[PDB]
Amino acid sequence: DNKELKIIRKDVAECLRTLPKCGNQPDDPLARVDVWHCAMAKRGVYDNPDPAVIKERSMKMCTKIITDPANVENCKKVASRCVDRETQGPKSNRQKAVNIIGCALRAGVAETTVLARKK
Amino acid sequence: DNKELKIIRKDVAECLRTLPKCGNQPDDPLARVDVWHCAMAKRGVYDNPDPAVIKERSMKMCTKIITDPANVENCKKVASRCVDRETQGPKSNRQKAVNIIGCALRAGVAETTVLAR
Numbered sequence A: 001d002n003k004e005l006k007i008i009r010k011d012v013a014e015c016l017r018t019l020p021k022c023g024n025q026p027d028d029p030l031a032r033v034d035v036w037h038c039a040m041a042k043r044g045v046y047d048n049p050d051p052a053v054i055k056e057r058s059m060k061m062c063t064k065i066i067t068d069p070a071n072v073e074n075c076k077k078v079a080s081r082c083v084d085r086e087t088q089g090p091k092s093n094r095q096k097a098v099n100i101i102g103c104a105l106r107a108g109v110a111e112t113t114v115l116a117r118k119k
Numbered sequence B: 001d002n003k004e005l006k007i008i009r010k011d012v013a014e015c016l017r018t019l020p021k022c023g024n025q026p027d028d029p030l031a032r033v034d035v036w037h038c039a040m041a042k043r044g045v046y047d048n049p050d051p052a053v054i055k056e057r058s059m060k061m062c063t064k065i066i067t068d069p070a071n072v073e074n075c076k077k078v079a080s081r082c083v084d085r086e087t088q089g090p091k092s093n094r095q096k097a098v099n100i101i102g103c104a105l106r107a108g109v110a111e112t113t114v115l116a117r
């Protein structure tokens, strides 16, 4: 929705600012795992560590930051897959969240978002 | 090929080791821009900053780390687009290289590689 994209953009900009500058990072914030995770964290996607809930909320987010229905479904399919894989094991909840984001970024979901197709 | 892939895997592992541990990074090295850039740098892809040369070498790399012909072509199309866009402007050559990698990662190319899978 046009209300939530305004909000997410403001959150990306703020994450860009507060996140530590570290070596070898792309200038494009939407190419950065730490920015996406930071942004999604603020939208509450990871406020509850239950994998089923993270999955619900991620799929909801796909609808939203993407308009094309085909790409919306691809995002949902990928969110499900990434949550299933990356919430297994003994890593911390915060690191699992970061890994989920990395999995989605690697899969190409970021490219299909309105944030990327309106820079 | 299998020989090139053996070499790249060894380069990824070594980049994983030598690269600074920075906050909020995925455990998956193939999800990391700094690892990919580090790996591709070692294969000489950015050994000459001429955009035309970076493009030729990137497209060549697509054929080595991807087997599906359809995905090979997509990688090539994306490499071309990223080099064209991210080598413009006054940023340093090294940073332009990193930005190229970030552009390809964002586009999904990493997912289609044999290393990933």
Ligand SMILES: CCCCCCC
Pocket (backbone or CB within 6 Å): A036, A058, A059, A061, A062, A075, A078, A079, A101, A104, A105, A109, A110
């Ligand atoms: C999969 C739900 C949003 C992911 C953000 C793309 C990096």
Ligand SMILES: CCCCCCC
Pocket (backbone or CB within 6 Å): B036, B040, B045, B058, B061, B079, B100, B101, B104, B105, B109, B110
């Ligand atoms: C410059 C080489 C393109 C392949 C990078 C994959 C992320």
